[PDB]
A paper describes a structure:
CDFs are utilized by MTB to transport iron cations from the bacterial cytoplasm into the magnetosome lumen during nanoparticle biomineralization. Like most CDFs, the magnetosome membrane-associated (Mam) proteins MamB and MamM share a common two-domain architecture consisting of a trans-membrane domain (TMD) and a cytosolic C-terminal domain (CTD). Here we studied magnetite cluster MamB and MamM CTD structures from a phylogenetically distant magnetotactic Deltaproteobacteria species, BW-1 (MamBBW-1 and MamMBW-1).
To obtain structural and biochemical information, recombinant His-tagged MamBBW-1 and MamMBW-1 CTDs (residues 190–270 and 213–293 respectively) were over- produced in E. coli cells. SAXS results showed that MamBBW-1 scattering curves are similar at concentrations of 1 and 5 mg mL-1, indicating that the molecular dimensions are independent of protein concentration over this concentration range. In contrast to MamMBW-1, MamBBW-1 crystal structure exists as a monomer and does not create the classical V-shape dimer in the crystal, yet superimposition of MamBBW-1 monomers over MamMBW-1 V-shape dimer implies that MamBBW-1 may in high probability form a V-shaped dimer under the right conditions. MamBBW-1 dimerization interface, similarly to all CDF-CTD structures, showed the typical parallel S-shaped backbone structure. Putative BW-1 C.B is composed of Glu271 (MamMBW-1) or Glu224 (MamBBW-1) from each monomer. Trp269, Val307 (MamMBW-1) and Glu222, Lys260 (MamBBW-1) are also located at the hypothetical metal-binding site but are not predicted to be involved with metal chelation. Overall, based on our analysis, it can be assumed that the composition of amino acids within MamBBW-1 and MamMBW-1 putative metal-binding sites are suitable to coordinate and bind metal ions.
Author numbering: 187 to 270
Write the structure that this text describes.
């Protein structure tokens, strides 16, 4: 349940993080005392590899700051969906 509190705050931040177009999905589970996060994000289709690595680092910083306990963070980046 404190798990849902963390997810909500994480989503609130990510929504306001300009390098991220949208949150695709946030999953969390407990592995003993470790919280495991899987974060899927939409980003601009033209990002470079370096920018993508820099966004994963920002996401990781956000989680580490919000969650007091030990965590693992896996981030996946997807091209934002463009209008047809």
């Amino acid at each position: 349940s404190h798990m849902e509190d963390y997810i909500e705050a994480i989503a609130n931040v990510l929504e306001k993080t300009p390098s991220i177009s949208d949150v695709k999905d946030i999953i969390a589970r407990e592995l003993g005392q470790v919280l495991e996060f899987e974060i899927d994000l939409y980003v601009p289709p033209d990002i470079t590899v370096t920018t993508g690595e820099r966004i994963k680092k920002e996401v990781n910083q956000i989680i580490k700051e919000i969650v007091d306990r030990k965590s693992t963070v896996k981030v996946r980046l997807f091209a934002a969906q463009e209008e047809l």
